């Protein structure tokens, strides 16, 4: 496989270091990609705030700094066809959809939309990335194409991208993942009507600070 190293920097240290039970392959549930699907996004440092030792050591602490090793498999048969675009986005701010210019009458995304959790969330307008920004140039980020006739896997080693070397892992999602079916799914009748997408992440080089019992 070919690894796209995000911004040419390896996740390095700078606080406790677990180094044993948090450097394991956390595997999220598979997403069923279909014909009329739109896309999916995941806010990362609050995907793993409910899963095991990393969630325990990220909720009971106050300072946090880590990188990530992503892995996105999408295993389909040799008769299906389509394409995915998997891309990480630093500081992925979800915009609100409306046409109101007043402060407390304009819409705003809820807590479940901004922080989806360990189950992700789907887009509403994937052409504008739900942020008023066209996705055609979204290749400016670190990204890979999951083309269902060349490969079925993608991997992104993403370092720590933040202005302050330590930040809260609960009230600030560092960066997001976005998978988008640019080319739709096509298949003849009699095949499997839905393709699973599996995501496994590894918290490389985790550092925690200021734990409140």
């Amino acid at each position: 496989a070919n690894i796209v190293l995000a911004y040419g920097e390896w996740p390095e240290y700078c606080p406790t270091r677990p180094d044993v039970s948090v450097n394991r392959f956390y595997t999220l549930d598979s997403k069923m990609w279909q014909e009329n699907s739109t896309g999916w996004y995941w806010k990362f440092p609050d995907v793993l705030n409910k899963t095991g030792v990393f969630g325990q050591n990220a909720q009971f602490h106050y300072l946090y700094r880590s990188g990530f090793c992503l892995h996105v498999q999408c295993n389909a048969s040799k008769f299906h066809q389509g394409a995915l675009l998997v891309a990480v986005i630093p500081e992925f701010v979800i915009a609100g959809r409306g046409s109101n210019t007043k402060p407390n009458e304009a819409p705003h995304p809820g807590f479940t939309t901004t922080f989806p959790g360990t189950t992700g969330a789907t887009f509403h307008d994937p052409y504008v990335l739900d942020s008023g920004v066209p996705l055609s140039q979204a290749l400016i980020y670190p990204h890979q194409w999951i083309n269902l006739r060349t490969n079925n896997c993608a991997t992104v080693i993403v370092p720590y991208i933040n202005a302050v070397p330590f930040d809260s892992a609960i009230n600030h999602s560092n960066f997001g993942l976005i998978v988008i079916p640019v080319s739709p799914l096509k298949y003849s009748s009699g095949a499997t009507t839905a393709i699973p997408i599996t995501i496994t992440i590894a918290p490389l080089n985790s550092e925690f600070g200021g734990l409140r019992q």
């Binding site: 394991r24 392959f25 997403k31 990609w33 499997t192 839905a194 393709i195 997408i197």
Partner: protein, 171 residues
């Protein structure tokens, strides 16, 4: 020596199809597929293997085990699955997020077709191996969306047995 476990030992099953875990494309994105125990000297799936018959002649055992899966399906069908070991103590996990915080291996079907999970340190609850639907079971047109997974299991170099005793499979 690796040996096919009888994980599908429920009723309404014929002779041979008790050795297979069925995987389909009708089941949803995140759901439980199959789970079983670890104790080889116990009435269950480990009664059909060879280590489960030898560890019955002896009354004490220790050491690590190895459970290896193998996917019998089409070549054009892909998808991910989460195999998850939960050590003794708490009961079987309820959701995929609780399982992936324990011991877990993400095994896909594209490249790998036979995963192997090593279970550490088990002796005379005893541990629980669960097997979850990660993403889906995608299948292209003109292909059956139903496959099987054979589970096999054996001991390791650390497995040691003590106290001889006559078995009870015979009368």
């Amino acid at each position: 020596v690796e040996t096919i476990l009888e994980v599908n030992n429920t009723t309404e099953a014929t002779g041979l199809t008790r050795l297979l875990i069925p995987v389909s494309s009708q089941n949803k994105a995140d759901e439980l597929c199959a789970a079983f125990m670890v104790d080889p000297g116990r009435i269950g799936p480990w009664q059909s293997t060879l280590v489960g018959q030898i560890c019955r002649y002896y009354t004490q055992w220790s050491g690590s085990l190895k459970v290896t899966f193998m996917f019998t399906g089409s070549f054009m069908a892909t998808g991910k699955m989460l195999v998850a070991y939960s050590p003794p103590g708490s009961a079987q996990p309820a959701n995929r997020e609780t399982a992936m915080l324990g011991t877990h291996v993400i095994w896909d079907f594209g490249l790998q077709s036979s995963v192997s999970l090593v279970i550490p340190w088990i002796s005379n609850t005893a541990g629980v191996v669960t097997l979850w639907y990660q993403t889906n079971y995608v299948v292209p047109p003109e292909t059956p969306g139903e496959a099987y997974i054979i589970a096999m299991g054996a001991a390791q170099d650390n497995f040691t047995l003590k106290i001889c005793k006559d078995t009870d499979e015979v009368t």
